[PDB]
Amino acid sequence: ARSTNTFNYATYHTLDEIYDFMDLLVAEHPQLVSKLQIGRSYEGRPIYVLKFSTGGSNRPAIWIDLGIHSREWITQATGVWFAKKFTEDYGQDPSFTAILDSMDIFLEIVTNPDGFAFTHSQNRLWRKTRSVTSSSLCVGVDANRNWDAGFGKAGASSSPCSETYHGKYANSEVEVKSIVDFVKDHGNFKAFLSIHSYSQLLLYPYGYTTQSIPDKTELNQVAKSAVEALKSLYGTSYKYGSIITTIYQASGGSIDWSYNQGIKYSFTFELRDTGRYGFLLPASQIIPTAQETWLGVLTIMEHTLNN
Ligand SMILES: O=C(O)[C@@H](O)Cc1ccccc1
Ligand SMILES: [Zn+2]
Structure with missing residues (x-):
């Protein structure tokens, strides 16, 4: 895909294709979208967030993340489609235009890049991260059980x-x-x-x-x-x-x-x-x-x- 207009939204893509898509989008709508790197994964892949904004300084914002569980491929696919849609609808859809005129949108398409790469190379149904658990042969953590909200209580496992x-x-x-x-x-x-x-x-x-x-x-x-x-x-x-x-x-x-x-x-x-x-x-x-x-x-x- 040489343009976000030639990218195939009706198929599932690899990590590189999605990362390349991000740069195409920024290049095409420099005034509306920016790519931020908020960290690096366990295996060192950059963690990227797309910021959609029409200006201001620290406007109230909306956070959207997809792919925290790597095998849920429909989510990363929807995230790519959303990124494109934001750039298409601004100035066309009255409602969406009013939102972007007053708020910023932060979109994290691939929240768990290491697990996503693993779903492509070895195990399509991998859910967790790829962190190495010290006293175990088992790899990874369920990133949706790792937040500080009733951490470790019932509804999560203690087994690596x-x-x-x-x-x-x-x-x-x-x-x-x-x-x-x-x-x-x-x-x-x-x-x-x-x-x-x-x-x-x-x-x-x-x-x-x-x-x-x-x-x-x-x-x-x-x-x-x-x-x-x-x-x-x-x-x-x-x-x-x-x-x-x-x-x-x-x-x-x-x-x-x-x-x-x-x-x-x-x-x-x-x-x-x-x-x-x-x-x-x-x-x-x-x-x-x-x-x-x-x-x-x-x-x-x-x-x-x-x-
Ligand atoms: O097991 C999961 O991660 C989710 O599918 C359900 C969930 C959503 C949000 C918070 C907790 C749990
Ligand atoms: Zn999930």
Whole structure:
């Protein structure tokens, strides 16, 4: 792909293709997009975030990350599509234009680059990072169990060989600490969205505790509105609710952490499907998934801009 206009959005790509895509995009829309390196992975690959902004100084922002679990390929694919869509819709879509005119969007397409490279080279279903666990033969940590939110409580495994291993301590994974430092340093994030697959769910906090968040009514109403928007295109049906009541008890998850930092609009999307293909969703479903997920995300952004 010589231009972001010739990149194939309807197929799954490797890490290099996605990193090359980032530079094409910046080159084409220098005034709107910037590439930031917020850290380096365990195996030393750069960790990149795309910043979409029309100016200002430390405008309130929206965080969106994809690919924290490497095998959920539909998420990195949706992230690439979103990056392109942002550049297409600014100045065309009134709603999206109003958002970018007042807020910045930070997009992390490949949150776990080492695991992503591993899914391409050796094990398509790899979920964790690739950090070497000292007193074990088992590699990696579930980066979505490593956050400082009920860290180590029920909903995570203490065994290094588990798919849900939480790691030695909160934020032990550089892929996680890189995000934590960046968001803490920025201090003006208003929304935090973390995308996964599969199950077709829209979740809000909490996963580590049965306690209800103080903003439950509002977040529930936003979730309802976002799922209605998403369903409007292809009829894809999503359920919504707090993590613990909807999926399962899970400790150390990112949105529990972000909400505890005061970032009210903290949500996780679990993309298509419901099990027919699961992690191996056909390339033919990439665009439809991305398009409908965009309506759900845009709904949340609109609420953020106004409240
Ligand atoms: O097991 C997982 O990571 C997610 O799919 C569910 C989840 C989302 C957000 C926070 C905790 C858990
Ligand atoms: Zn996941």
